[PDB]
Amino acid sequence: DLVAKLRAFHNEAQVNPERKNLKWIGLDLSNGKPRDNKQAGVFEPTIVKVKSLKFATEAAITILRIDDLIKLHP
Amino acid sequence: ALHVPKAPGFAQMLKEGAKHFSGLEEAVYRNIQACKELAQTTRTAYGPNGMNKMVINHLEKLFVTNDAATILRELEVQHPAAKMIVMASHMQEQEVGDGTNFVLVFAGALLELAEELLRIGLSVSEVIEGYEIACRKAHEILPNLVCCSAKNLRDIDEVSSLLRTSIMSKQYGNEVFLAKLIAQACVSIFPDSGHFNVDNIRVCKILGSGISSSSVLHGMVFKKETEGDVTSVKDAKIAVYSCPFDGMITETKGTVLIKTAEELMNFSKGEENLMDAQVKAIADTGANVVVTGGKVADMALHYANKYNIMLVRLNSKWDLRRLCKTVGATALPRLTPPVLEEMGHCDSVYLSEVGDTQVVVFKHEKEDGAISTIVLRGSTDNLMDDIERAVDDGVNTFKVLTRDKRLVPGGGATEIELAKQITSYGETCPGLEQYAIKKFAEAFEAIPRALAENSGVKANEVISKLYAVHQEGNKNVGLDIEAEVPAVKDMLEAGILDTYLGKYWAIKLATNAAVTVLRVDQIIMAKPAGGPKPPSGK
Amino acid sequence: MICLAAEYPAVKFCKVKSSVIGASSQFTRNALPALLIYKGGELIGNFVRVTDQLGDDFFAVDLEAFLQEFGLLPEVLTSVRNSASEDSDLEID
Amino acid sequence: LDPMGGIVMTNDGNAILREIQVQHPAAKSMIEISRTQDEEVGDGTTSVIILAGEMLSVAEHFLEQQMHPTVVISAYRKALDDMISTLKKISIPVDISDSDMMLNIINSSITTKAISRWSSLACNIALDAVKMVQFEENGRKEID
Amino acid sequence: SRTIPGKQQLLIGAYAKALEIIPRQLCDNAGFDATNILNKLRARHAQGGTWYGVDINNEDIADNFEAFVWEPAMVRINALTAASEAACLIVSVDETIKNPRSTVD
Amino acid sequence: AAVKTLNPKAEVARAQAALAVNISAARGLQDVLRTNLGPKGTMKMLVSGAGDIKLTKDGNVLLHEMQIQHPTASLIAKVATAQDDITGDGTTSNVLIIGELLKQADLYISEGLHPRIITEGFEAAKEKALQFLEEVKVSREMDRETLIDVARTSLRTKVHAELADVLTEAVVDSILAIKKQDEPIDLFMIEIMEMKHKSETDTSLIRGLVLDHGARHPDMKKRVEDAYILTCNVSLEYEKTEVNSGFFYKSAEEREKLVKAERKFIEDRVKKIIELKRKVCGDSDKGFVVINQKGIDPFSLDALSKEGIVALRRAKRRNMERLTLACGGVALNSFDDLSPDCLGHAGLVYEYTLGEEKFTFIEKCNNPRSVTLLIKGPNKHTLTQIKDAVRDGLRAVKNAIDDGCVVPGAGAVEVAMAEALIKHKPSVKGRAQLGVQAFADALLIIPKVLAQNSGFDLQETLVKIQAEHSESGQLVGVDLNTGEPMVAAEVGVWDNYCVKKQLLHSCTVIATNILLVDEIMRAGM
Amino acid sequence: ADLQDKEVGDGTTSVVIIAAELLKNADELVKQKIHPTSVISGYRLACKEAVRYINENLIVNTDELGRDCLINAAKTSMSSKIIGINGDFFANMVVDAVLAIKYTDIRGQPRYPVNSVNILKAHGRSQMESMLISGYALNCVVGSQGMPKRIVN
Numbered sequence A: 001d002l003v004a005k006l007r008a009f010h011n012e013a014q015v016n017p018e019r020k021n022l023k024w025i026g027l028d029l030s031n032g033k034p035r036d037n038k039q040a041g042v043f044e045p046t047i048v049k050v051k052s053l054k055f056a057t058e059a060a061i062t063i064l065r066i067d068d069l070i071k072l073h074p
Numbered sequence B: 001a002l003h004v005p006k007a008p009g010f011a012q013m014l015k016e017g018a019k020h021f022s023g024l025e026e027a028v029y030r031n032i033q034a035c036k037e038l039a040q041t042t043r044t045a046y047g048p049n050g051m052n053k054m055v056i057n058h059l060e061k062l063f064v065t066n067d068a069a070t071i072l073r074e075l076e077v078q079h080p081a082a083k084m085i086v087m088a089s090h091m092q093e094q095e096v097g098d099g100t101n102f103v104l105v106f107a108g109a110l111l112e113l114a115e116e117l118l119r120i121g122l123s124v125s126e127v128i129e130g131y132e133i134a135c136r137k138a139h140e141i142l143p144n145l146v147c148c149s150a151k152n153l154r155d156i157d158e159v160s161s162l163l164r165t166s167i168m169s170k171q172y173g174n175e176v177f178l179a180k181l182i183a184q185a186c187v188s189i190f191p192d193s194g195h196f197n198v199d200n201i202r203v204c205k206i207l208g209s210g211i212s213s214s215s216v217l218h219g220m221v222f223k224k225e226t227e228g229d230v231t232s233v234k235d236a237k238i239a240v241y242s243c244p245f246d247g248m249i250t251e252t253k254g255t256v257l258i259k260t261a262e263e264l265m266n267f268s269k270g271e272e273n274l275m276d277a278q279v280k281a282i283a284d285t286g287a288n289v290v291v292t293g294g295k296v297a298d299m300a301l302h303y304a305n306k307y308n309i310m311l312v313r314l315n316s317k318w319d320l321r322r323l324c325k326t327v328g329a330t331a332l333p334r335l336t337p338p339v340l341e342e343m344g345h346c347d348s349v350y351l352s353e354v355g356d357t358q359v360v361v362f363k364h365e366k367e368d369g370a371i372s373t374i375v376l377r378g379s380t381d382n383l384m385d386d387i388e389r390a391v392d393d394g395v396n397t398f399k400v401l402t403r404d405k406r407l408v409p410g411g412g413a414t415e416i417e418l419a420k421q422i423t424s425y426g427e428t429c430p431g432l433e434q435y436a437i438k439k440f441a442e443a444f445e446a447i448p449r450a451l452a453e454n455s456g457v458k459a460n461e462v463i464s465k466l467y468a469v470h471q472e473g474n475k476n477v478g479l480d481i482e483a484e485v486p487a488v489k490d491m492l493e494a495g496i497l498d499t500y501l502g503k504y505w506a507i508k509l510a511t512n513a514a515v516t517v518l519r520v521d522q523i524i525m526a527k528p529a530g531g532p533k534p535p536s537g538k
Numbered sequence C: 001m002i003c004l005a006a007e008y009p010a011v012k013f014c015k016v017k018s019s020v021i022g023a024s025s026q027f028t029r030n031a032l033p034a035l036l037i038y039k040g041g042e043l044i045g046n047f048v049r050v051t052d053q054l055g056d057d058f059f060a061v062d063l064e065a066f067l068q069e070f071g072l073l074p075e076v077l078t079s080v081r082n083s084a085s086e087d088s089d090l091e092i093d
Numbered sequence D: 001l002d003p004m005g006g007i008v009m010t011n012d013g014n015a016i017l018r019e020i021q022v023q024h025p026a027a028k029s030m031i032e033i034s035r036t037q038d039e040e041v042g043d044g045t046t047s048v049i050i051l052a053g054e055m056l057s058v059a060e061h062f063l064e065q066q067m068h069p070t071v072v073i074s075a076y077r078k079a080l081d082d083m084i085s086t087l088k089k090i091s092i093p094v095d096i097s098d099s100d101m102m103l104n105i106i107n108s109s110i111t112t113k114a115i116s117r118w119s120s121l122a123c124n125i126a127l128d129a130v131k132m133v134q135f136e137e138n139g140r141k142e143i144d
Numbered sequence E: 001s002r003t004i005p006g007k008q009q010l011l012i013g014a015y016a017k018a019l020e021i022i023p024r025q026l027c028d029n030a031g032f033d034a035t036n037i038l039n040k041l042r043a044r045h046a047q048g049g050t051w052y053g054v055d056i057n058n059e060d061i062a063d064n065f066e067a068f069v070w071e072p073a074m075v076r077i078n079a080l081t082a083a084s085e086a087a088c089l090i091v092s093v094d095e096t097i098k099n100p101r102s103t104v105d
Numbered sequence F: 001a002a003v004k005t006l007n008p009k010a011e012v013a014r015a016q017a018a019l020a021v022n023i024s025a026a027r028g029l030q031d032v033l034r035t036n037l038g039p040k041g042t043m044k045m046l047v048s049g050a051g052d053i054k055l056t057k058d059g060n061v062l063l064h065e066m067q068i069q070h071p072t073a074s075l076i077a078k079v080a081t082a083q084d085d086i087t088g089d090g091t092t093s094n095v096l097i098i099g100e101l102l103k104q105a106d107l108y109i110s111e112g113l114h115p116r117i118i119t120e121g122f123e124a125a126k127e128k129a130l131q132f133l134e135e136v137k138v139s140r141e142m143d144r145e146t147l148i149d150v151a152r153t154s155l156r157t158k159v160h161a162e163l164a165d166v167l168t169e170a171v172v173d174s175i176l177a178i179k180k181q182d183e184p185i186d187l188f189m190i191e192i193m194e195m196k197h198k199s200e201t202d203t204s205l206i207r208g209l210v211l212d213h214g215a216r217h218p219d220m221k222k223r224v225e226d227a228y229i230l231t232c233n234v235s236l237e238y239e240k241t242e243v244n245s246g247f248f249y250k251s252a253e254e255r256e257k258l259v260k261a262e263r264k265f266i267e268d269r270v271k272k273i274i275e276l277k278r279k280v281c282g283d284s285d286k287g288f289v290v291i292n293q294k295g296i297d298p299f300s301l302d303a304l305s306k307e308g309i310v311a312l313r314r315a316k317r318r319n320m321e322r323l324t325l326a327c328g329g330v331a332l333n334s335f336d337d338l339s340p341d342c343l344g345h346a347g348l349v350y351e352y353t354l355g356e357e358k359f360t361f362i363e364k365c366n367n368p369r370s371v372t373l374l375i376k377g378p379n380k381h382t383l384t385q386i387k388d389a390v391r392d393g394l395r396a397v398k399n400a401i402d403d404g405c406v407v408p409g410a411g412a413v414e415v416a417m418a419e420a421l422i423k424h425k426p427s428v429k430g431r432a433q434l435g436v437q438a439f440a441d442a443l444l445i446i447p448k449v450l451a452q453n454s455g456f457d458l459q460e461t462l463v464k465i466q467a468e469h470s471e472s473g474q475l476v477g478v479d480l481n482t483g484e485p486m487v488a489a490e491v492g493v494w495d496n497y498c499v500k501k502q503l504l505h506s507c508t509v510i511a512t513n514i515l516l517v518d519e520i521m522r523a524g525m
Numbered sequence G: 001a002d003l004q005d006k007e008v009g010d011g012t013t014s015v016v017i018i019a020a021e022l023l024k025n026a027d028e029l030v031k032q033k034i035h036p037t038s039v040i041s042g043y044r045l046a047c048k049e050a051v052r053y054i055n056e057n058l059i060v061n062t063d064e065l066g067r068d069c070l071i072n073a074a075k076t077s078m079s080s081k082i083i084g085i086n087g088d089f090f091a092n093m094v095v096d097a098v099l100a101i102k103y104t105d106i107r108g109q110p111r112y113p114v115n116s117v118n119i120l121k122a123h124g125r126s127q128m129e130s131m132l133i134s135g136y137a138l139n140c141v142v143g144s145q146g147m148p149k150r151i152v153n
């Protein structure tokens, strides 16, 4: 339910041109409800998300290429 | 200066494998901890939102169910205090048939709060006295919490509504259908005579068609096949024999003595003629169905086929007795034809196939009979076992209703009311027993707490709302499980009702088990023996 | 061994059972004290049956001195710890 | 019984706990707590262990219910701040120039040990040693 | 499922998606391309045609009723009932307990 | 040692080692069994090898179920077993007194005193104590109130409060029911049957019999109002000839005739039973019940049920005597000459079922000389504990009835005997006065242990009791609720005189024999 | 996870979780007979577009926020940690230290050399007694007791 509410908020933000302030709606883990995290002061560097996305994509791509494993006995 | 010797006295005289525990810390607290662990193991199966548990015993037999008594039975419990709790649960099951999980939860809460009371400075005797006083007060209060009575047991709709609560805890998704089936089965049984027999309800589990295809049959179903050519009778005149369908023989020693050629030539002919005469004498009484409990000779089967007689063989004598009760016949010990009074009557006896199993059905068209059978369908043996356990719980609930017709509100409403009243009484009790009385009252909170935990809501505000409403004066308001948030509703109108006898006996047995566990001060366990079980238990 | 390991961080004192190694019955019956030494993968000491030369109630100092007789043992208290990229510092540049 | 053959008679919390070998890491944490208390102030070693045990028990009480540990931790930290405030509120000053008051303080400190049979002598010894070990050089005060 | 509040909507939609395993498995066993056949079947059933299924020989979809691919309704009724009962029984279980064996020999 | 020289694989203790070993074992037993004494004692839990739970408070049951392999422990166990078998009470006191006797004897022996002097002092003190016990006993007409008090002083020490309260009435009423004037009481006439379906407080007394089996024929009546009871020891089932009879026939008709004619022997006796039933009663109201020690085959069962007769087979052997004494018939080993005057009468016979086992109740007898005690409880260990408690209570009431006297309890008699022994000590010539003092101190263990279990301290409570007794002269015991001195006679705390005499005799004998043992050997291999 | 720690220092759990979820969904697609090459191309395109959308829309410029932005970022990073509740003071200490070790280089780029903040651990008083030294802290003592333990200038 919480993720559905968050997705609904973000969809309304992306569809309605006048609701660009709803992009900041995140999760308030204490109250278990969506909360405007930009006002609440929940921030993190952009580099964290960018690097994590790039590294996770590269790792998933690397693993996804393996379709045959040969394990030589020691 | 590097080893502690065993203290002189009892420590040195102890055997090699024995264990000795004495005092509060190493005996009472250990017992309370073990009982609390057992209660935690059984807790998550409480209430309608309880979860089934897959249990595999030492024989690889698989049990999936949320029935507390079954789970304890199929668990190799080794701690003796938990063993006492298990015996209390089994006694509750034998006496009433429902409330075992209540017994475990209440006993665990009582023992945990007793441990707290002992820790804060109280003594064992004071805690025991307080628990006894509070149990007496609860048993006094309980009759005042009765909300309504059954007031009718020959009706189908009312009985179904009454047993819906009993079989809602198990099989929460579909309880109306099972309620209707069990209500019909119980109403068919329980004649004008006030006595009701639990054994008279029979359950037949046939795989294949899902549990919604189950039904109730006014008769008996045997997973067997007819031994003769006849496979269907429309006006059955069953004659039941406990003796094998064969020419009887001397019990001392049989020896055919032949001295002339004539005797040798005529012996077999005479035997066959005698068997034919006996079978024809049986048939001349109109008995078109013959049931025997022993072997069937080839000659007897031949002559029964010649006279169009249906043969059904029952290996178990219990099945023979139940069939005799169902049809109304007498199990003749000889091969004599049945008299007009010893002859049973059934409205239809035929061979049928359900799923892939061949069965013999003794059907009564009337809406009566001494024995009724519930045929259970399903897609799994374990599922049908669970359905059978639910049916047993419903039948036991109906039996209790026949015994005592009073009912109390469920969903923790009765427990919350009892807790509030016992707390009020204890607040006015001077002395040190007030702490024990208040703790006994608080132990009742474990029922609504367990219900709220299993339903997926927070128990704290559920209990706070229950106290608020009960302070306002509504004694029939309990937990509402049809909600995503903590909420309460009046349950007298909702129909969730618990039997008065069930609560009474559950409280009594749980208190007795807790007190008995608390009374133990020293434990002396002998060295375990790997024997092949004691002879008495086989 | 416990005392010496406490006072010698470099050493890596370890113990084994005679049953897990599956040695000969003679070892299990008459060679219970066996202090093998591994310096670079080879023995520099093979002390077996040290009871006669050490006694039965020897202490840490006795074993330490006996081992130091043949030169087996190589020659402050922080608060808790000090250890915490390689960029250190710079100024203006 | 020391593993090397020694004998230890004590009722000190840290002295007892340092001689116990445990496998559960929580017990290791508790022993480290005892050592921390002993090294930092040298007293109240059993008291800190007992208090930690009691607080963890009353925390388990709530953990049995559906309360997240973070809420319990926040309540505990608020309680710790309030405890510090109250302890500073109910405190009283001491004139260190008064030898009798210092001797009485040391006495109340050592009433729980085996040396309490000779209390005046031990108190005088400790006070005199601490007084004459006191040093002040280059504007820095030390005891050591 | 598109006409209910939404908590049950996701689960009933998951059930409907799970019902698609049979044509997908048929295509996978036949060496087809399952995704394209499934898309064509979905588009056809949406726009009409109750009896359109996988045509193995032609590597396409076709009216199976007119292709005489007939099975009794009892088969699918019982299959759905038994599969649902098994799934519910498995989901309901939360804890598994295995007692130690006796007479291990 | 010399034995070790002759037999290398032998272990021997000599000189003071023997005394040390024996006294250590006795002190260990005393330390374990101290907590049992008194109504305030602590219940012990006993788990066997199979996992069975045994909850008890007896000294004898505990001693049997302690995992002990010590010779002195075996000796004390044998002494306690004899005490329990003869008198039925005093096992815990037996062990306590023996242990304290050995401890007090060692207190002087360790200072260079030979044990023979201590034994002589023990014998003199035992004689004086027996004389004082004869002097102090209270000879009373054993009415119902005194028996109730004795049953309370036993059961309350054995079980919980109101359970003991119920068991007191049950035991006293049963004993008074089976007791014949100026005749010894036969305790075998009180059947102890237990069922496992009710609370522990539902234990009651039935003025009749309860049998753990019922009618095997489903057509038999489940409730008979006015029953003629027939107690027989005649086999009503088919029995083969002793001399290997066998049958010989030549045709099917001959085989049928032989089959029909081979049952005539049993059918004749069944016919005799049926004829007697017809003659004695001609109305449907009166009922007939047949209780047979031997088996009854299905044919006889069917024949009897067709005549409305309830038949029970394979009855217990003692149930013959019990039914004869209760119902009032004559147990018959044959039906050669049976008459209506040999039939017992019962005012109500009904059959009760419980799970897989069935019970038969025979109540409303005219004046039953044999009654039954029905123990009800939810647990097997509860049933066992109640059975042990009622055994102790029955023994206590029987002893109180037999010996017309009774001794004040609560340790008052022990304090009085200790004072008397101390007063008599100067009369004893020689160094046996030390043995007399040790005997008095050992006798003083009972009030000490009672005060300790009650929660008070031994020394101050004991000196208070002794000061009160010296000042007033009354038999003041120990109040387990306050610790103050209290008159046992005025409150109803009674002890069996025979139990006390047996305690004195056995404890003195066993302590004297143990103290004189100077070597333990094991060289039988 | 090690590389994410080395190059960023935060989100070492989120990267692992995201990578595993991506792998699981990609395997599901492959089991649906989608060729892994197409899945890899789609993942590359999705990652590129996600980075572009983040850099275009979801970023917040800290110029108009101030030191409160740094305090909030430190508090957010210190949640889920042993010092999470004491963030109100720990974040102030962190920001003060980072601003203290600030230096500039060529091209006028303010570079902040973390790992120049010597972190010293010592059990004892509560976490609120953690000290932010306005200088440097050494885990060393004077070589001999003769020397003074305090020098002013």
Ligand SMILES: Nc1ncnc2c1ncn2[C@@H]1O[C@H](COP(=O)(O)OP(=O)(O)O)[C@@H](O)[C@H]1O
Pocket (backbone or CB within 6 Å): B045, B046, B047, B048, B050, B068, B098, B099, B100, B101, B102, B103, B165, B168, B169, B170, B409, B410, B411, B412, B451, B479, B480, B481, B496, B498
């Ligand atoms: N629809 C319902 N809403 C709320 N509570 C219910 C409902 N149905 C049953 N209960 C509660 O569930 C409890 C039964 O738990 P159950 O699993 O039967 O344990 P036991 O078998 O030991 O009685 C009853 O006390 C009843 O109050």
Ligand SMILES: Nc1ncnc2c1ncn2[C@@H]1O[C@H](COP(=O)(O)OP(=O)(O)O)[C@@H](O)[C@H]1O
Pocket (backbone or CB within 6 Å): D013, D043, D044, D045, D046, D047, D048, D108, D111, D112, D113
């Ligand atoms: N005379 C006394 N009366 C009451 N309490 C005392 C007295 N002397 C010491 N205490 C208490 O005993 C405690 C000291 O116990 P101690 O053995 O020192 O354990 P710890 O070293 O953990 O403090 C203190 O909390 C103090 O309050």
Ligand SMILES: Nc1ncnc2c1ncn2[C@@H]1O[C@H](COP(=O)(O)OP(=O)(O)O)[C@@H](O)[C@H]1O
Pocket (backbone or CB within 6 Å): F036, F037, F038, F039, F058, F059, F089, F090, F091, F092, F093, F094, F153, F154, F156, F157, F409, F410, F411, F450, F477, F478, F479, F480, F493, F495
């Ligand atoms: N109400 C009472 N008040 C004081 N003393 C009592 C009371 N009841 C029993 N006693 C004493 O406690 C003792 C009980 O001992 P008991 O446990 O019966 O040992 P045993 O079973 O070996 O006789 C008796 O000797 C009796 O004198």
Ligand SMILES: Nc1ncnc2c1ncn2[C@@H]1O[C@H](COP(=O)(O)OP(=O)(O)O)[C@@H](O)[C@H]1O
Pocket (backbone or CB within 6 Å): A027, A028, A029, A042, A044, G009, G010, G011, G012, G013, G014, G015, G076, G077, G079, G080
């Ligand atoms: N106060 C808060 N409210 C809501 N979300 C938060 C809060 N603090 C941190 N988060 C979120 O929790 C997520 C997990 O961060 P965390 O796991 O502590 O970092 P790491 O992944 O480096 O371990 C972060 O993505 C962050 O957005």
Ligand SMILES: [Mg+2]
Pocket (backbone or CB within 6 Å): B098, B099, B100, B166, B169, B393
């Ligand atoms: Mg139930």
Ligand SMILES: [Mg+2]
Pocket (backbone or CB within 6 Å): D043, D044, D045, D109, D112
């Ligand atoms: Mg101190």
Ligand SMILES: [Mg+2]
Pocket (backbone or CB within 6 Å): F089, F090, F154, F157, F392
């Ligand atoms: Mg007694």
Ligand SMILES: [Mg+2]
Pocket (backbone or CB within 6 Å): G010, G011, G077
């Ligand atoms: Mg982080």
